[PDB]
Amino acid sequence: STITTHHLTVPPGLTPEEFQELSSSIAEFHSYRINPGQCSSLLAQRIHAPVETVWTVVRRFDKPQTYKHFIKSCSVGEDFRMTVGSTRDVTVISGLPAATSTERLDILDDDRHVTGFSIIGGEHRLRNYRSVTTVHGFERDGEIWTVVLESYVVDVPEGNTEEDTRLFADTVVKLNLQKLASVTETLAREA
Amino acid sequence: STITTHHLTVPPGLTPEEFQELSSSIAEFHSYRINPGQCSSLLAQRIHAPVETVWTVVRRFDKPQTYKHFIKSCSVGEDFRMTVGSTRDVTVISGLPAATSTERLDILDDDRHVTGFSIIGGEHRLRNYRSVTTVHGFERDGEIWTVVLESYVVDVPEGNTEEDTRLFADTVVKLNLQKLASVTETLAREA
Numbered sequence: 001s002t003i004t005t006h007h008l009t010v011p012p013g014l015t016p017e018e019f020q021e022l023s024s025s026i027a028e029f030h031s032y033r034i035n036p037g038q039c040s041s042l043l044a045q046r047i048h049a050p051v052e053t054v055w056t057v058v059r060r061f062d063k064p065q066t067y068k069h070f071i072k073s074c075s076v077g078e079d080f081r082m083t084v085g086s087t088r089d090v091t092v093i094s095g096l097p098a099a100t101s102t103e104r105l106d107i108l109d110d111d112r113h114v115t116g117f118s119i120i121g122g123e124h125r126l127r128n129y130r131s132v133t134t135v136h137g138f139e140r141d142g143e144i145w146t147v148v149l150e151s152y153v154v155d156v157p158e159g160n161t162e163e164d165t166r167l168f169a170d171t172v173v174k175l176n177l178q179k180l181a182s183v184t185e186t187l188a189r190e191a
Numbered sequence: 192s193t194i195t196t197h198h199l200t201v202p203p204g205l206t207p208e209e210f211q212e213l214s215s216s217i218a219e220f221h222s223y224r225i226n227p228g229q230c231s232s233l234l235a236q237r238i239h240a241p242v243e244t245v246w247t248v249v250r251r252f253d254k255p256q257t258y259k260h261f262i263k264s265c266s267v268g269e270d271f272r273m274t275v276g277s278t279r280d281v282t283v284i285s286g287l288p289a290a291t292s293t294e295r296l297d298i299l300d301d302d303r304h305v306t307g308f309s310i311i312g313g314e315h316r317l318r319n320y321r322s323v324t325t326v327h328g329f330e331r332d333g334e335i336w337t338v339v340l341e342s343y344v345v346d347v348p349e350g351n352t353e354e355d356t357r358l359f360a361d362t363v364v365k366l367n368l369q370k371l372a373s374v375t376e377t378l379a380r381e382a
């Protein structure tokens with residue numbers, strides 16, 4: 001059992017100067033105690049849009065399809081409210097027969113721009129998956145931009161190397177963060 | 192048994208005027224006779240780069256990782272030459288235990304900018320997968336751009352709707368074409 005070290009390495013796609021401004025947030029929100037058989041990763045994405053524009057999309061637990069790829073549909077309860085412990089049923093585009101991943105909302109902090117979720121049923125390739133996404137505003141000489149950080153911890157299935165699990169989860173997260181950027185930059189450029 | 196009708200519908204992300212310039216090419220290269228239990232799709236991507244810049248990337252059968260997502264590695268023979276009937280072994284990022292998809296190069300026409308491949312082993316979700324990619328130059332008042340068209344035909348696995356198979360294959364193709372655009376536009380803007 002160890003503690004992750006995401007707060008001591010510059011995540012790809014981030015400047016060292018950006019990283020050093022984010023160190024405390026990475027320690028607070030993007031650290032995990034990991035056991036053997038588990039792996040963890042931290043991904044970053046710079047977005048040329050204001051923080052609240054990005055957050056408004058990131059915080060919509062009931063509409064992951066807005067920025068995530070491979071979502072066929074997302075269903076929530078009839079009296080769903082955006083509250084910790086609530087769940088969503090996501091239908092992922094797998095090439096396999098129709099199914100659903102049940103996901104639990106773990107964190108929602110509208111003041112600090114933190115959210116996170118856990119996969120609690122369905123996707124057997126990501127058993128014990130848990131992620132946290134945070135949104136951060138930057139300013140330099142009157143210019144503003146945003147950085148989104150997303151980390152996860154996950155169990156490595158029996159009969160898989162860590163390096164294959166990480167490579168799948170990283171690719172999904174990185175692609176989703178790219179879509180988040182395009183979606184919110186379009187919104188920023190247009191609105 | 193029917194003939195696909197990709198040449199009579201405007202593919203998403205294409206203007207009707209672009210489509211009507213491409214009708215003959217869609218009929219020649221992006222038509223398939225499909226049997227029940229099979230589905231087919233045509234995808235388009237506009238790229239702001241010259242045709243040969245895009246083609247140089249599209250034609251590299253031995254380096255699909257340059258524009259495709261989820262590729263861990265690609266291996267070809269020791270005396271591999273870029274010739275029809277040649278194969279490549281691609282390791283796809285599945286979240287599942289390491290494996291390989293064997294893919295056959297079906298077409299290569301450097302004069303008409305046509306290529307295509309078939310999956311001939313591995314990916315059981317895409318049995319009988321076959322695609323064709325063509326690259327087309329456009330000009331308007333001295334401005335030039337490119338359009339890439341990619342179609343496939345594939346068997347729908349037992350225990351799957353067509354709509355789930357198509358949605359997976361379409362998402363993969365569309366995402367790959369997006370990467371192709373970014374890769375080649377970067378190359379065009381920079382070089």
Ligand SMILES: O=C(O)c1cccnc1
Nearest residue numbers: 068126168169170172173
């Ligand atoms: O955020 C998700 O839904 C996700 C991330 C990594 C892998 N699979 C799913």
Ligand SMILES: O=C(O)c1cccnc1
Nearest residue numbers: 259317359360361363364
């Ligand atoms: O082009 C590919 O490699 C591909 C396209 C669709 C689905 N799976 C793979």
